[PDB]
């Protein structure tokens, strides 16, 4: 699809993957800089689906795809998202607010609500996953798990990303939007914690262990008591209890408004 003459990429890599690593570029569309996944059979397949889930999405809080390149490597050319992941941002940038956090959570609840009316599960949801536009706008991304929900069903059946993942995913392989809530609830988390790993010094079995005795993650300093009782609500142990995407965004809507009149 791209023409490989028209981009031109930077030596040095944002970031990797198992997939190869991330790179800056600029693609001749005005002049697009761009984000490049370049890769390093299955993992082309896994490229191609990946693209093919992007594609088909158009929300402002989803990171968006330009094309394929297949040249030295395959590529796939998305937006850039110039101030990376959420995480890394907010382990460098300890002073943002938390009327600012509570923005960026309401952003990704958005696009996961955009998502979940779409019926495609994200399956990688977490603070690594969702990157800066500004400071004042997040979108998600890393589609390379996502899978797009069978006509007559609303979970997916399957290195698994276990501190992210709600017991469903864990006890019976089913990934639904619901699993993708649980998700957020530990990416809130994360947020909240100014990018610090959720479940410290434990093994994944260890957490396991502690959701299945009703643990959960303590709230983070200085969080607001109605953003922990919403991680809290995330971490619903029944999948048929847990809230969706509607009911989650409404709630982040309703408390930045009440934080923005002040
Ligand atoms: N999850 C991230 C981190 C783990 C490996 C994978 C990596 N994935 C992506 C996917 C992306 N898709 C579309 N646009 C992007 O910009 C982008 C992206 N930018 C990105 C990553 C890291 C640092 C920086 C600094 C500026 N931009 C950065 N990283």
């Not at 299955?42 to 390149?69: F, H, S, T, W």
């Not at 969080?223 to 971490?235: A, F, H, I, Q």
């Amino acid at each position: 699809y791209l023409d490989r003459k028209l981009l031109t990429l930077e030596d040095k890599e944002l970031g990797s993957g198992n997939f190869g690593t991330v790179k800056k570029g600029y693609y001749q569309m005005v002049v697009k800089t761009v984000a490049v996944k370049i890769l390093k059979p299955a993992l082309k397949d896994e490229l191609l689906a990946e693209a093919n889930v992007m594609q088909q999405l158009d929300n402002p809080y989803i990171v968006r795809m330009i094309g394929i390149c297949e040249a030295e490597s395959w590529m796939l050319v998305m937006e850039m998202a110039e101030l990376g992941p959420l995480n890394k941002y907010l382990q460098q940038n300890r002073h943002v607010t938390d009327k600012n956090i509570i923005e960026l959570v309401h952003q990704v609840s958005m696009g996961m609500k955009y998502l979940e009316e779409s019926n495609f599960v994200h399956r990688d949801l977490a603070a690594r996953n969702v990157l800066l536009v500004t400071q004042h706008y997040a979108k998600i991304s890393d589609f390379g798990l996502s899978k797009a929900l069978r006509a007559d069903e609303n979970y997916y059946k399957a290195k698994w990303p276990v501190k992210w993942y709600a017991p469903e995913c864990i006890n019976y392989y089913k990934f639904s939007s619901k699993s993708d809530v649980w998700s957020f609830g530990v990416l809130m988390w994360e947020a909240f914690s100014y990018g610090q790993k959720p479940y410290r010094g434990m093994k994944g079995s260890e957490v396991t262990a502690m959701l299945e005795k009703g643990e959960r993650m303590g709230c983070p300093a200085g969080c607001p008591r109605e953003m922990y009782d919403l991680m809290n609500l995330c971490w619903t142990y029944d999948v048929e209890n847990r809230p969706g995407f509607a009911a989650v965004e409404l709630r982040l809507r309703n408390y930045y408004y009440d934080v923005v009149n002040e």
